[PDB]
Symmetry: C2
Subunit: 315 residues, 2 copies
């Protein structure tokens, strides 16, 4: 349907096939962070039914992302199948979900790509340090697609939410001093995205036990400290709630913690059988559009503390 | 080892994978004869161990050759495996043999490519007419390879000789008025290539029965008439003899006529147990080098008759 989506599937398929032939060492060399793979295809009077006839596909730092996927417990064959066996589905920058709901494909700016290159080494090192146990986005691949005229950049992350268990409530938390509330327009969306005030006002509670809570908050502390160190800000805590009862009305309500890695079960005395999905999202700056907000007070360290204070209170 | 060979294997693999997704109709449209598929790969600081880092692969008329392969009873998966599972072996224009001895890969000039395009439609139509039963070369694919600086063209044909049964004697027959003999240098090669005089002088006989002989000569007549019609000349009858006894000394001596399609068993009263492999080879003009022979009398119709007269006599 969408030619850009076709090129992405084609490219991911190509990219993974290529890597299956490469010998994978335990380590990355400094050059792997500067590397890329470029393919330009020109078909003249051939294969019109599947593909655009002129296109480009570029993969950034293929070894680093190969290395990241394995560290995040993702097999390259599964990753390939998830993205190629059937088209990713949209939902209206744009984003798509792998047909099997395991991965998110987000469209990003060339600026975001530049910034991602800039932090990639430090990010990789962080992932090594924490043994891939983090609430940070799991970056799984980054690509450039060209189809006659149009150039787009995409990044692929692991879904914060479950691939089985549906989410009925969804929050996006920053802990900002300025008031954050979903629009009266937004508060009426299909599955809306609520914000800080929506959480305070409606007195939402997260029923997880003290251990889970301590572990989570420790992970969060380290992750956010790392983000502040990179001078990054404006990230959010995405919180999604699965209602086992409501999902039965429309494993009994249990999940695979190896696929749905951000899941946390509610404790025994929880008012309703709930599973939580929580993670940091949207870590890049995107100054192009933040300059667009400016044209027509808090620093990264401030934000870090403000954000950590708030999440500590709501749990 | 040889980067050009690596690109060919890579390209054939790519090309066949692409086609496995295309819906194959029973017919070719006129545009399929003008079509091609072009891939340009640039790897920067990536995958140095397998592939050259900058290369191009072009496939000419992919649908026509897909259509030809099936008409010649060749499955695309087998064709792919034969050319990709292990490197083709040389033997010192250059030519290579698929590791399994089923296919020949010949290096040709851009002129040969131009001429092949020119006759491709008429050749396809001929193959349709004779239901793929012909002594003509079976053209199976045509490609252009570029590896930083060097550009080569290759064509792939079915081996005239067997993939199991070794050939101990080998003739190349034109039936020319001018004397054709292998050099005293050549007559001493490992497995030499003998010519017209070598055949007359050494009184070689081909022991096939009257039916086989009649069928063969009828096929030959049509094939050669077709070649003369295209104003082509200077082609040869390649004759290879397998000695069942000698191959035992170094199925008992029987072959699969579906893989070794040019095989003909000897008749019952044959002096020794022999299998023959006979086919027309080298049909293109290559005027570049024939002008090189000129710079430092017979026409296509003459050649046709001369060639047919001679082969009739020797069998």
């Amino acid at each position: 349907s969408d030619p850009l989506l076709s090129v992405l599937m084609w490219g991911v398929n190509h990219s993974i096939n290529e890597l299956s032939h490469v010998q994978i060492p335990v380590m990355l060399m400094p050059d792997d962070f500067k590397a890329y793979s470029k393919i330009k295809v020109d078909n003249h009077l051939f294969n019109k039914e599947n593909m655009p006839s002129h296109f480009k596909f570029k993969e950034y730092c293929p070894m680093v992302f190969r290395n990241l996927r394995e560290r995040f417990g993702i097999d390259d064959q599964d990753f390939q199948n998830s993205l190629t066996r059937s088209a990713p589905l949209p939902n209206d920058a744009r984003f798509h979900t792998s047909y099997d709901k395991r991965y998110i494909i987000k469209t990003i700016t060339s600026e975001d790509v530049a910034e991602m290159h800039n932090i990639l080494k430090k990010y990789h090192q962080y992932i090594v340090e924490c043994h891939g146990i983090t609430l940070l986005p799991q970056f799984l691949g980054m690509y450039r697609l060209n189809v006659d005229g149009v150039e787009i950049y995409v990044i692929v992350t692991r879904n914060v939410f479950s691939h089985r268990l549906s989410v009925y409530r969804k929050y996006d938390l920053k802990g900002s001093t300025v008031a954050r509330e979903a629009s009266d327009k937004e508060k009426a969306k299909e599955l809306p995205t609520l914000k800080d005030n929506d959480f305070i006002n409606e007195g939402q509670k997260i029923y997880i036990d003290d251990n889970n809570k301590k572990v989570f908050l420790e992970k969060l502390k380290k992750d956010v400290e790392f983000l502040a160190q990179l001078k990054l800000m404006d990230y959010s805590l995405l919180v999604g709630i699965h209602d086992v009862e409501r999902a039965e009305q429309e494993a009994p309500g249990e999940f695979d913690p190896n696929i749905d890695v951000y899941g946390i079960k509610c404790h025994e005395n929880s008012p309703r059988k709930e599973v939580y999905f929580m993670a940091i999202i949207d870590i890049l700056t995107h100054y192009d559009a933040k300059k667009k907000a400016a044209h027509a007070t808090v620093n990264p360290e401030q934000y870090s503390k403000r954000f950590l204070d708030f999440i500590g209170h709501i749990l």
